[PDB]
Amino acid sequence: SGFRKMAFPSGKVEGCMVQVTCGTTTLNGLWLDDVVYCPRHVICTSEDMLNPNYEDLLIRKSNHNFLVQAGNVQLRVIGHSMQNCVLKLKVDTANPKTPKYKFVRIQPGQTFSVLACYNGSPSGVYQCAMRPNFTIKGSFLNGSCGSVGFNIDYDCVSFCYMHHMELPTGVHAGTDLEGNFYGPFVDRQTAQAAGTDTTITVNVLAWLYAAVINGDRWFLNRFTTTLNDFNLVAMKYNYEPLTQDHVDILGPLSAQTGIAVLDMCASLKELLQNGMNGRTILGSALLEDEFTPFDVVRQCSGVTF
């Protein structure tokens, strides 16, 4: 028993991290097969970031302007292209530690592990959710750019995030591994802001199910609700709409605990209206929304990799 914010073991991804330097700019790259993926802003100075023309900045660069260090080994760049906001450096050596992997674009509410790196070296691993406003609440200092987010399914690494930017509120923005930004952000140093965030309703319900599995049930009640009546209340508290697809996704947790999804919704409705009344759930005074239904089943049933 017990419930922790739990990252995927980072070993398969640690074997893929490299350092990329272009002029005075150093950041992290992801080395898979014979390609290194990094943020295209590696080709910018701080001055260039104000109004960069990436096409123009890139065409002035040759293969040998890009220094890739795997750890102690210099990789030779033999080619480069831009895909959206990521630079692809073709290198002379395929990564022997290349795991089974795909590139996936995740939806808001989905969680992943971040391996925070500096100079191609990992400093640590933590769990993040893609917020409904397409930001993540990460821990990233300057030099963390090119750090990646991922899930592991059996032996297959699903890379979903590459780190590009910190917004003024101290939250973080980046791309999928095809270089498409999550959220309405651009890789220029211009005024940009996180939108008003909302609570990931399906995740709060998953976490209430986690609480029940772990022996906390004070918040359960004898009431039920329609999906529609639930959403009419939850919307007022800046909670994301709960869909029938969310309800279906919560099926396994509902079956395991014997609490119907709409009954857990009735519990959450009451919690939003009344607060906790000085009580806590799984050691939190707040309703936690950064655990998916899958995160709860995976942790509460011990699935391995």
Ligand X SMILES: CSc1ccc(N(Cc2cc(Cl)cs2)C(=O)Cc2cncc3ccccc23)cc1
Q: Residue 251 binds what, of ligand X, its own copies, none (CB under 5 to 8 Å, by partner type)?
A: none
Tokens of 211: 């609480």
Q: Is 160 a catalytic residue?
A: no
Q: Return d(Cα 218, Cα 212) in angstroms, integer.
A: 9
Q: How deeply is 106 buried, as exposed, middle or buried, from its count of CB atoms within 10 A (0-12, 13-18, 19+)?
A: middle
Active site residue 117: no
Name which of ligand X, its own copies, none residue 223 binds, using a CB cut-off of 5 to 8 Å depending on partner kind: none
For residue 292, give Cα distances in angstroms to 91, 111, 210: 37, 7, 10
Taking the complex as a whole, how short is the minimal distance between the CB of residue 5 and ligand X, in angstroms? 18
Interface positions, 127-186, toward ligand X (CB under 6 A): 140-142, 144-145, 164-166
Judged by the rule CB under 8 A, the positions of this chain that interact with its own copies are: 1-12, 14-15, 115-119, 121-126, 128, 137-141, 143-144, 166, 170-172, 214-215, 280, 283-286, 298-305
Residue 24: what are its φ and ψ, rounded to 5°? -100, 0
Closer CB to its own copies, residue 148 or residue 262?
A: 148
Give the whole-angstrom CA distance, residue 291 versus residue 210. 9
213 binds ligand X (CB under 6 A): no
46 binds, among its own copies, ligand X, none (CB under 5 to 8 A by kind): ligand X
Amino acid at 184: P
CB 89 within 8 A of CB 80: yes
Q: For residues 131 and 144, is the Cβ–Cβ distance under 8 A? A: no
Nearer CB in complex with ligand X: 28/198: 28
Question: Does residue number 253 form part of the binding site for ligand X (CB under 6 A)?
Answer: no
Q: How far is the CB of 199 from ligand X (least distance, A)?
A: 24
Q: Does residue 57 touch ligand X according to CB under 6 A?
A: no
- Residue 183 Cβ vs ligand X, minimum distance, rounded to whole Å: 12
Residue 111 touching ligand X (CB under 6 A): no
Of 255, 240, 241, 267, nearest to 296 by C-alpha is: 255
Report 68-107 residues binding ligand X (CB under 6 A): none
- Where on the phi/psi map is residue 209: left (φ > 0), alpha (ψ -120 to 50), or beta? alpha
Dihedral of alpha carbons 279, 283, 286, 291, sign: negative
Q: Which does 187 bind (CB under 5 to 8 A by kind): its own copies, ligand X, none?
A: ligand X
Give the span between the Cα atoms of 183 and 171, in whole angstroms: 13
Given ligand X, its own copies, none, residue 164, with its beta carbon under 5 to 8 Å by kind, binds ligand X
For ligand X, the binding residues (CB under 6 A) are 1, 25, 41, 44, 46, 49, 140-142, 144-145, 164-166, 187-189
Q: Which residues are catalytic?
A: 41, 145
